[PDB]
Amino acid sequence: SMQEEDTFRELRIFLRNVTHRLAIDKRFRVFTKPVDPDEVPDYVTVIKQPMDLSSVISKIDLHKYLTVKDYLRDIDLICSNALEYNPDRDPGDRLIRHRACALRDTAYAIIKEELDEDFEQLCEEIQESR
Ligand SMILES: CC(=O)c1nc(NC(=O)[C@H]2CNCCN2)sc1-c1cc(O)cc(O)c1
């Protein structure tokens, strides 16, 4: 309905604002663009489902997220992809894993603090009816 497209538009506005706040954080610069095969050739090997914050913005604009859970699944994908590509003890890996955990925890904490629980529930129930 008009009432439901309003809800989904508000969700999109919210998710764009969260994602922008993640994307401008210096810690998360490695997660802002897709991995370049030129700069990192063996990534396309290990990571079957690449994800990054620019792709999140495009999916928002494509109406691909109808719920916050849907969005958080892709945030979790950015994080788990980074843990898988960086399993070793050496400091390059440990630094990426730390930022990846911080990206995930930051996204969850912004949503917990600023997203109304009844709004996310409305989003869920509209989606379940489709
Ligand atoms: C996002 C990600 O998971 C990622 N992981 C890396 N790991 C390493 O470089 C590890 C590999 N093991 C040996 C020690 N170095 S680099 C990197 C990345 C970094 C950027 O500046 C841009 C970008 O698009 C991706």
Curated annotation (Swiss-Prot):
Interacts with ESR1 and NCOA3 and these interactions are enhanced by estradiol. Interacts with acetylated lysine residues on histone H1.4, H2A, H2B and H3 (in vitro). It comes from the Eukaryota. May be a transcriptional coactivator of the nuclear receptor ESR1 required to induce the expression of a subset of estradiol target genes, such as CCND1, MYC and E2F1. May play a role in the recruitment or occupancy of CREBBP at some ESR1 target gene promoters. May be required for histone hyperacetylation. Involved in the estrogen-induced cell proliferation and cell cycle progression of breast cancer cells. Belongs to the AAA ATPase family. It is found in: Nucleus. It comes from Homo sapiens. Residues 108-130 form a coiled coil. The chain holds residues 981 to 1108 of 1390 of the full protein. Induction: Up-regulated in breast, uterus, colon, ovary, and stomach tumors. Induced in breast cancer cells overexpressing NCOA3 or treated with estrogen. Down-regulated in 5-fluorouracil-resistant derivatives of the colon cancer cell line HCT 116. Highly expressed in estrogen receptor positive breast tumors and in osteosarcoma tumors. This is ATPase family AAA domain-containing protein 2. Residues 3-114 form the Bromo domain.
